[PDB]
Structure formats: C-alpha cells, structure tokens
Amino acid sequence: KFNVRLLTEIAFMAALAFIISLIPNTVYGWIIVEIACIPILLLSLRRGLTAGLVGGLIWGILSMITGHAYILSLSQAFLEYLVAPVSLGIAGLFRQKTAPLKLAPVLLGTFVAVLLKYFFHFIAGIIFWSQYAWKGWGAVAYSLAVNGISGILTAIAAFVILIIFVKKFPKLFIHSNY
Numbered sequence: 533k534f535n536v537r538l539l540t541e542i543a544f545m546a547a548l549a550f551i552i553s554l555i556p557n558t559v560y561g562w563i564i565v566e567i568a569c570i571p572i573l574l575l576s577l578r579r580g581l582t583a584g585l586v587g588g589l590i591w592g593i594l595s596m597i598t599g600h601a602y603i604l605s606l607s608q609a610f611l612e613y614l615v616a617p618v619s620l621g622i623a624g625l626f627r628q629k630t631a632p633l634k635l636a637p638v639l640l641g642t643f644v645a646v647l648l649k650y651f652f653h654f655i656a657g658i659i660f661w662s663q664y665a666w667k668g669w670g671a672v673a674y675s676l677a678v679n680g681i682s683g684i685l686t687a688i689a690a691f692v693i694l695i696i697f698v699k700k701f702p703k704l705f706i707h708s709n710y
C-alpha cells in the first residue's frame with residue numbers, strides 16, 4: 533500500500549473515470565449507462581474502501597470543475613457529484629487480497645456499489661428532478677424508473693467489463709508490492 537504508487541493509481545483511475553464520463557451514455561432522457569463508474573469500481577476492488585472513496589471524490593470534483601456536472605443547487609450537487617461518486621468506494625469492502633481471485637465478490641461489490649450510488653440519485657430524483665416526471669408519473673415513481681433502470685444498466689456494463697477483466701486479467705484485482 534506504498535504511498536506513491538497508491539496515490540498514482542488513485543489519481544489515474546479518477547482521471548480515467550472522468551475521461552470515460554465524456555463518452556455519450558444516454559439511453560433515454562436521464563436513463564444512462566454510467567460506464568464511468570468502472571475505473572472507480574476497479575480501484576476500490578483492488579485497493580480497498582478508503583482509496584475508492586478518495587477516487588470517487590476526485591472524479592466528482594473533476595466533473596463539477598470542468599463544467600460537466602448538471603447542477604441544480606448546492607445540496608443537489610453535493611449529493612449527486614460528491615456523495616454519489618464517493619459511495620462507489622463501498623466496493624472496497626469486497627476487496628480480495630489473496631489469490632485465487634473469485635468472481636462472486638467482484639460482482640457483489642460492484643452490485644452493492646452501483647446500487648448505493650443509484651440509491652442516492654434516486655433520492656436526488658425525488659427532491660430535485662420531479663419537474664421532469666413523465667406525464668402521469670409522480671415523483672417517486674419517476675425517480676425509481678429513471679434511476680432504477682440506470683442503476684441496473686450501469687451494473688450490467690460494469691459486470692460485462694469486470695467479468696472480462698476477471699477472466700483475462702485477474703491480477704488487476706489483487707494488489708501486491710514487489
């Protein structure tokens with residue numbers, strides 16, 4: 533967990549997440565597949581909770597200071613661009629330090645982290661985005677559909693990519709000095 537290498541990986545994955553976040557990802561309206569979560573999920577899985585949290589923090593800051601965040605208020609910004617991307621760090625609780633690498637924990641951490649992130653967007657949807665609720669939908673129903681569907685699709689893409697990495701590059705997930 534040597535500091536320079538550790539800090540470098542953190543910076544690298546936050547930057548990567550930011551850069552991937554520049555790829556168009558809209559399916560319909562605010563229904564998206566947030567492939568940009570993946571670098572942070574990988575960072576968390578490999579390096580653990582704290583690193584993941586910090587990587588998420590950095591990515592969220594980047595989103596906002598480069599003008600790519602959609603901000604409606606300070607509270608909403610804090611929730612959706614600090615709390616939400618930080619919360620991806622929870623994948624770090626499912627880190628595996630010892631080989632052989634198992635698939636299940638990678639999927640569990642991913643599922644839990646994407647769920648938690650989209651849980652905060654869901655809340656945010658109720659509070660701040662209800663004006664956009666499709667005709668005839670109430671605020672909770674709209675937010676669940678929107679953020680529920682985005683969360684699932686996002687978990688799908690994370691699953692696909694991370695499953696390829698587990699089969700191809702299992703070592704991405706296991707940190708070692710040496």
Ligand SMILES: CCCCCCCCCO[C@@H]1O[C@H](CO)[C@@H](O)[C@H](O)[C@H]1O
Nearest residue numbers: 542543544545546547548590593594597
């Ligand atoms: C106005 C506040 C901005 C300054 C406070 C710290 C900025 C957060 C990012 O820090 C570093 O910045 C590099 C370029 O910004 C990133 O590429 C790198 O990943 C990151 O580690």
Ligand SMILES: Cc1ncc(C[n+]2cccc(CCO)c2C)c(N)n1
Nearest residue numbers: 562602612653654656657661675678
């Ligand atoms: C109903 C609804 N619409 C929009 C948003 C905003 N939102 C949703 C998902 C992810 C993100 C972060 C950038 O990908 C944002 C800002 C919402 N929460 N709910």
